[PDB]
Enzyme design. Structure first.
Site, PDB file in Angstrom:
ATOM      1  N   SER A  23     -11.611  -8.673   3.626  1.00 19.27           N
ATOM      2  CA  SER A  23     -12.179  -8.166   2.366  1.00 19.27           C
ATOM      3  C   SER A  23     -13.118  -9.166   1.686  1.00 19.27           C
ATOM      4  O   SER A  23     -13.967  -8.771   0.893  1.00 19.27           O
ATOM      5  CB  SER A  23     -11.118  -7.747   1.382  1.00 19.27           C
ATOM      6  OG  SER A  23     -10.609  -8.727   0.586  1.00 19.27           O
ATOM      7  N   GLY A  65      -8.045  -6.453   4.624  1.00 12.01           N
ATOM      8  CA  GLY A  65      -6.698  -6.604   5.144  1.00 12.01           C
ATOM      9  C   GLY A  65      -6.600  -7.132   6.564  1.00 12.01           C
ATOM     10  O   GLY A  65      -5.478  -7.322   7.040  1.00 12.01           O
ATOM     11  N   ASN A  74      -5.553 -13.539   5.593  1.00  9.18           N
ATOM     12  CA  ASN A  74      -4.405 -12.604   5.528  1.00  9.18           C
ATOM     13  C   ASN A  74      -3.217 -13.144   6.278  1.00  9.18           C
ATOM     14  O   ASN A  74      -2.078 -12.973   5.819  1.00  9.18           O
ATOM     15  CB  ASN A  74      -4.855 -11.234   5.988  1.00  9.18           C
ATOM     16  CG  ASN A  74      -5.754 -10.564   4.978  1.00  9.18           C
ATOM     17  OD1 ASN A  74      -5.387 -10.514   3.809  1.00  9.18           O
ATOM     18  ND2 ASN A  74      -6.929 -10.088   5.387  1.00  9.18           N
ATOM     19  N   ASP A  88      -6.898  -7.293 -10.612  1.00 10.45           N
ATOM     20  CA  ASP A  88      -5.794  -8.041  -9.968  1.00 10.45           C
ATOM     21  C   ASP A  88      -5.897  -9.569 -10.029  1.00 10.45           C
ATOM     22  O   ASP A  88      -4.938 -10.279  -9.747  1.00 10.45           O
ATOM     23  CB  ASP A  88      -5.542  -7.539  -8.504  1.00 10.45           C
ATOM     24  CG  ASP A  88      -6.833  -7.426  -7.622  1.00 10.45           C
ATOM     25  OD1 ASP A  88      -7.783  -8.183  -7.876  1.00 10.45           O
ATOM     26  OD2 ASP A  88      -6.934  -6.563  -6.674  1.00 10.45           O
ATOM     27  N   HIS A 110      -9.224 -10.142  -5.984  1.00 10.39           N
ATOM     28  CA  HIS A 110     -10.456  -9.797  -5.244  1.00 10.39           C
ATOM     29  C   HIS A 110     -11.687  -9.928  -6.148  1.00 10.39           C
ATOM     30  O   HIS A 110     -11.725  -9.355  -7.206  1.00 10.39           O
ATOM     31  CB  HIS A 110     -10.392  -8.386  -4.701  1.00 10.39           C
ATOM     32  CG  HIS A 110      -9.248  -8.143  -3.755  1.00 10.39           C
ATOM     33  ND1 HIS A 110      -8.074  -7.507  -4.106  1.00 10.39           N
ATOM     34  CD2 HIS A 110      -9.158  -8.386  -2.440  1.00 10.39           C
ATOM     35  CE1 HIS A 110      -7.290  -7.417  -3.054  1.00 10.39           C
ATOM     36  NE2 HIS A 110      -7.931  -7.914  -2.021  1.00 10.39           N
TER      37      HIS A 110
END
Ligand SMILES: CCCCCCCC(=O)O
Length: 181
Positions: free
Chosen positions: A11, A45, A74, A155, A158
């Site tokens: 991402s 992801g 990740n 969040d 990101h």
């Protein structure tokens, strides 16, 4: 000629929950006009293993001159053993070279609050592999971006759309010596 830069990422390169055209690799493509083409092959992801699974088709399809590898975050955010991420990245680098492409390896780091021994071990894989393969080690932008709330999604994890032009410009500067426009 107009060479291709393939970005093999997660991402951080795809952009989380945004249009492909909004993400920094597309903005970089636009900045470069047709001097160099940027193909974003990034999926939110993805683990390093998932990126490796996608790679052979992309090398065949795109026949890139350079492959920017931006993977392993990740794996680290899921507490995977560093040696497995190292080995997966090693294989990616081998495959890129064996396709007559130049790998560019982006350093990845986990946040300051992550477990410290683990984060050190995770982060050390990147300079190790860049030295082993004698490939460019590109710097990592995420901590700087996270300092700007106005560049982060709700969040605080990101980057948002407004971050992307800044990232693109910064990446253009890092990649200038490699593309030699
Ligand atoms: C802090 C390490 C960098 C992680 C980026 C990947 C997040 C995602 O792919 O959705």
């Amino acid at each position: 000629g107009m060479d291709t830069l393939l970005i093999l990422g997660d991402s951080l390169s795809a952009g989380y929950r945004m249009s492909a055209s909004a993400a920094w690799p597309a903005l970089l493509n636009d900045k470069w006009q047709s001097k160099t083409s940027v193909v974003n092959a990034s999926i939110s992801g993805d683990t390093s293993q998932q990126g490796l699974a996608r790679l052979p088709a992309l090398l065949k399809q795109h026949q890139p001159r350079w492959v920017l590898v931006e993977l392993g975050g990740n794996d680290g955010l899921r507490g995977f053993q560093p040696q497995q991420t190292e080995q997966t990245l090693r294989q990616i680098l081998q495959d890129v070279k064996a396709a007559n492409a130049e790998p560019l390896l982006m350093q990845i780091r986990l946040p300051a609050n992550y477990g410290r021994r683990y984060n050190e071990a995770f982060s050390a894989i990147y300079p190790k592999l860049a030295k082993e393969f004698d490939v460019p080690l590109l710097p990592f932008f995420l901590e700087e971006v996270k300092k700007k709330p106005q560049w982060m999604q709700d969040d605080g994890i990101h980057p948002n759309r407004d971050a992307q032009p800044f990232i693109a410009d910064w990446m253009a500067k890092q990649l200038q010596p490699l593309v030699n426009h």
